[PDB]
């Protein structure tokens, strides 16, 4: 939920979780030619407008051990 970090701040957000936990920028995406395939909505869509933090990154922080967003 509502914790808004944009641009540089959104990178910083990503870092403070997946800086150790491993990265993967799930937009509504896998990687490459990947289409619309996450109700999660978007990396940017979340972190800059709604959800980013320790919990509310993982899906798009990267979801490597926990599939975690809220």
Tell me the two tokens of residue 16: 């403070």
- Location of structure tokens 């993982």: 58
- What CATH number does the domain containing 35 carry? 1.10.100.10
* DSSP 8-state assignment for residue 53: S
Which residue range(s) make up the domain with 46? 1-70
Write the CB contacts of 23 (distance below 8 Å, at least 6 apart in sequence).
Answer: 14, 61, 62
Q: Are 61 and 5 in contact (CB under 8 A)?
A: no
Q: Please tell me the distance from the alpha carbon of residue 50 to that of residue 43, in angstroms, as a whole number.
A: 10
Tell me which method was used to determine the 3D structure.
NMR
């Amino acid at each position: 939920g509502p914790e808004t970090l944009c641009g540089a701040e959104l990178v910083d957000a990503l870092q403070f979780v997946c800086g150790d936990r491993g990265f993967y920028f799930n937009k509504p995406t896998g990687y490459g030619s990947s289409s619309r395939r996450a109700p999660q909505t978007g990396i940017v869509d979340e972190c800059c407008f709604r959800s980013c933090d320790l919990r509310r990154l993982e899906m798009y922080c990267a979801p490597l051990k926990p599939a975690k967003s809220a």
